[PDB]
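Lecture notes, structural biology module. Today: joint structure prediction for complexes of six components.
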Amino acid sequence: EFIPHIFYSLHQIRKDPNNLSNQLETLTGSIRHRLKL
Amino acid sequence: KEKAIPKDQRATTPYMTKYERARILGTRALQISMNAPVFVDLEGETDPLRIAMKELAEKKIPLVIRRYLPDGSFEDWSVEELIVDL
Amino acid sequence: MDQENERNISRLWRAFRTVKEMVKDRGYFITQEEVELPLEDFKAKYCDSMGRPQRKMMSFQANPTEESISKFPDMGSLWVEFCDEPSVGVKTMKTFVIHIQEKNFQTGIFVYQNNITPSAMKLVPSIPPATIETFNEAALVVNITHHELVPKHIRLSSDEKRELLKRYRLKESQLPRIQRADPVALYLGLKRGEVVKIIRKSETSGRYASYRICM
Amino acid sequence: ALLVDVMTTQGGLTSVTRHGFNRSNTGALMRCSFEETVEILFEAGASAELDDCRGVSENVILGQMAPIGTGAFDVMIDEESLVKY
Amino acid sequence: TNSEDKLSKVQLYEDLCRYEDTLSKLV
Amino acid sequence: TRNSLGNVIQFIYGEDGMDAAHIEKQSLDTIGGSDAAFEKRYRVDLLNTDHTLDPSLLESGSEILGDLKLQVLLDEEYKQLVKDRKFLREVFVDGEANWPLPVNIRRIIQNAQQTFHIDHTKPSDLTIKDIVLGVKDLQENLLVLRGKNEIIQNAQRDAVTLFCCLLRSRL
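The predicted structure, tokenised, for the full assembly:
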């Protein structure tokens, strides 16, 4: 399953941009992983 | 003809040694220098060794290497099917 | 209790343990507990009231395991007997030979203390297909196979010998050879024309296997 | 490793001298090549010894091509590929 | 060869395509 | 390796069948070091907080945590490393680590890092399955002897044992 994970990661992006760049980069990498699969 | 090994039961390396390479180049250079037909598109070369290398590059030398096992049997490998490192 | 008594007792116990190790290594069935018998039990059993070592009660018969029989169908029972006399006479050797023959044993081990008369050893090869092998007591105190420089040897069956000979495409006179008087050959009891495999360590590949033939 | 394996391959310690190598089973000319020529020739004659002419020295004496590297194989012509062209 | 042509014919293929493009722009 | 009469002197040249000019000094990292350093360096655990992978290293670090097949594979790998340590300490009782061997793996890895301009500040898109299976397959594709009976198979594994040990050590 990639659809709910994409949704959720999308929402903690749009909820907390104030996270340090580390979390943003890691989470974007996670979304790139899910759409790659 | 009992010595010859069937093609399926060939258990020698599929790469060609430096000794086989030098022997093949020497034989081909001699044959070219004795006015043998050339199988490739010669382009401005006048040295039999370089034309031998050129023919080797496109894998067009029509020779076969026979490899002698210690007991006396032998294994036949065409020059076309031998992998040459570069 | 003079010191020489317990010195000789300890050396004899050492030789007994070494002989048991050898018999186990020849493919026979020997328990680990029997190999590790402490010297106190040895003194309790194989010594009289005066502490004299009663060698004559130590003779025993051993039989091959299931695995050895499967690998070597021809292998049979073995008998081992000690001799009390400082020198073995002709009559004692004849009695031992007759005992082995009537027991119909394929091989026997005769351990002597100091010396054997030439007429006694005249009878050694006179009982085919039985084999008689002698081991001087002073040479069995320490197990040779337990040294660091001695690699591990294994014996090969007829089928394994044939398969190796075919696969390497060889005739038996081109393999490396090992003599009969070689101590490990006596230990394993190799006859003429038998192939022994060697496993060894190597700086370049870790483990390496060689082969040799008994000539 | 090779030197040690050669020295102890006959079941015993074979020294690198005439007594160890020139008393081996190798070819007559090979053995007579160094240090005991005439006596080895005499003994080979008296025992009717057969030489096989496969070592390097026997192919150097007879002026032929030893099986050494480039000489370990034969070069032959393939008719199928030649006709295919 | 006609398989990919049929796959490109249905809209949701283009949908996943520009969705991938949009995430590429976002990254 | 034979002679003019055909007698075998060695069943393989050098016991590994390698040319003498393709061999350089390389260090086996499994032999030396205390058990704590070994455990920290080579052990990975997806269920214990002590020995987890930091999710900022692996691109899929978030989802992999808590899986079952992955930890089984990692356990097999760690058992292999332990057996390798035991064997290597059996061979070299002095505890030395530098021995001559073929292929300089350090230079190959450095070339891979230099050529692709790899930036360490970003997550990598690798997969544990892919790494383990790739290393095992590469071991499967190392050949010196090309027989077919069991004898040649045993000889070839015996030949390539130590190199496989180093390869497992580095990757």
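Point to remember: Residues 11-26 of chain E form the longest helix (16 residues).
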